[PDB]
Design a protein around this ligand. Sequence first.
Ligand SMILES: Nc1ncnc2c1ncn2[C@H]1C[C@H](O)[C@@H](COP(=O)(O)OP(=O)(O)OP(=O)(O)O)O1
Ligand SMILES: Nc1ncnc2c1ncn2[C@H]1C[C@H](O)[C@@H](COP(=O)(O)OP(=O)(O)OP(=O)(O)O)O1
Ligand SMILES: [Mg+2]
Length: 616
Amino acid sequence: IDELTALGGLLHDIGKPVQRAGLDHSTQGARFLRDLAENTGRAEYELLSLFSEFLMIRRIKELSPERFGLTMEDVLNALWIVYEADNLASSRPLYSVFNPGKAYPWAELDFEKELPVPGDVFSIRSQDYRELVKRLWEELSKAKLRSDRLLPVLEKYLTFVSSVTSEGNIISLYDHMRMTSAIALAMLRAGCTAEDVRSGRCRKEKRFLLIEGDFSGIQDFIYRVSGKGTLKYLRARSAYLELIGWDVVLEILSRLGLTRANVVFNAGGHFMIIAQNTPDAVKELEEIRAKAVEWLYREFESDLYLAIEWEPVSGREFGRENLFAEARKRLKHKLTVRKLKCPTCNRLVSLGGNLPKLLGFGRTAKNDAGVLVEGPFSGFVPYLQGGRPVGEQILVKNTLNPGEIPESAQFVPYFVADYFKKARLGVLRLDVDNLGQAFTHGFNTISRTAAFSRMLSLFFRQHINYVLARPKLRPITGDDPARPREATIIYSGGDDVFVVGAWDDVIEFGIELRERFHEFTQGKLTVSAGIGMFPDKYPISVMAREVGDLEDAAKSLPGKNGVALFDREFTFGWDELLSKVIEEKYAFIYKLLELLPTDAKQLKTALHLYIYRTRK
Ligand SMILES: Nc1ncnc2c1ncn2[C@H]1C[C@H](O)[C@@H](COP(=O)(O)OP(=O)(O)OP(=O)(O)O)O1
Ligand SMILES: Nc1ncnc2c1ncn2[C@H]1C[C@H](O)[C@@H](COP(=O)(O)OP(=O)(O)OP(=O)(O)O)O1
Ligand SMILES: [Mg+2]
């Protein structure tokens, strides 16, 4: 009955593409799960097809729910739980979060290295929905009937499919189904019966927890070593953090009996989970929140803290009736007051050169052989581009197919940008401006939040890799031979980016990337950046701190929309740098400096640029 509800909410809308291909959605999607049921040899799909189908009690009859382990009682419970989980989560396209008059063509979420590139209103033919169903069906046929494996098939085919073919629909059908699923699996963990649902009690009783966790002291976790620490360490030190993070999230999910579908987003080392508000959950988090802080202390004392708060909410606090934004307000407040009170250094060195051949990590007991690096509750075991995955959960890298992974192993797909090139260093720090304001008052429901939250991570977990290996702007470096950015990434996640490389590509790249960010957000968000330049061997910690000081400069600017490149206090706009510093003004220049306002600034730097393009 838990799984039934997991996949039930997951598959309730499955016939949208099936009706939108001409094979309602409740009548079509159901044949689909019956066809698939009588075409693979698992009737489970036959019983699940009923969630789409919704006479009732005699269609639950015709199928004999007890051939699994399911009382006709249990089955009606999940049919209503899921019904209203669909209502809580609240030949056309899926419009964009940012611009609601541009829209994309249904593309796949794992074909071509890309899946964006939308355009003015193009409304989708049946032929399109017919090759989609051609796939989905195959991957449905070959998948295990279990969330961890069913989620990424839906993620894969339905990301760029509209959950309701209303116009300006920002919510993809995959963010609908997950939320529907997230919410169902928790009602059920929160003991809603059909009696409660009908009475509208899963809609005013505060039956859910909105669990939220957010890391602090990351800057001082990731950046704190001196000479001892190559790019091989900084990357795996950054990787170990995601792993701490995953280890908290997967443990929360272990112990509250949930799915990855409940993970609204987990971006930046900041996470949101939807959960049953019960007292054995609250008393189960208290023990995660407490065990994991104890552990982050004993192993880093105060350098790294993870604050986890939770705020019980009602079903109508997923939507607006502005109630979601409020719950998040008290939870962000709650969250805020929750902070302010060498063998690892070496296990991470092995990792940073394994990193180029790594395909995942198995997640196991800390006392399990293979373990390279341990998190609060679990050990991790690098799954290598040679060997065989080895965990109860396997955090698989950059891809939504499990492939050569064992069954008894929750497939956990996780995206990370790692472009990396296999007289100074060029260091970028970039952070999307005021973004935690866009999330409260632009997205003020739980699905839009997940919707929006998922495109950002996409941009910083994937798209960013493509400006690195497919760069266009090059006014300093020059077009010449089509070559990628001479760079590595240390972190690209949340809304924060830290890239090292060739002094010049980095300057161009913060720009080109801000550029994409500009297009990809259609002007709707901004980024400020530090860029600094450094000799060779220097306290990474100090390259952090100084480039941080630059962005802090760029950030203390009014309107917050530029870069503070030159360590000097003379920042410019993304296209004030490009238009006037570079496209206009950029021994004689050497003496110019020794001699001694909007233009004097843009001249000041242009010369600094000119210089830097030539020394040696
Ligand atoms: N996994 C990672 N690997 C490498 N660098 C990271 C990683 N995650 C985050 N960062 C960076 C990007 C963010 O700007 C920064 C967040 O800083 P943090 O140490 O949390 O203090 P802060 O002053 O920015 O605010 P707060 O402590 O309240 O979150 O850490
Ligand atoms: N991929 C994502 N999904 C969901 N939320 C995200 C994502 N990335 C970032 N966030 C949210 C969570 C954080 O509270 C916030 C981080 O933004 P950050 O740049 O640190 O501060 P801010 O943008 O809110 O204001 P400012 O940058 O001006 O201090 O954005
Ligand atoms: Mg940030």
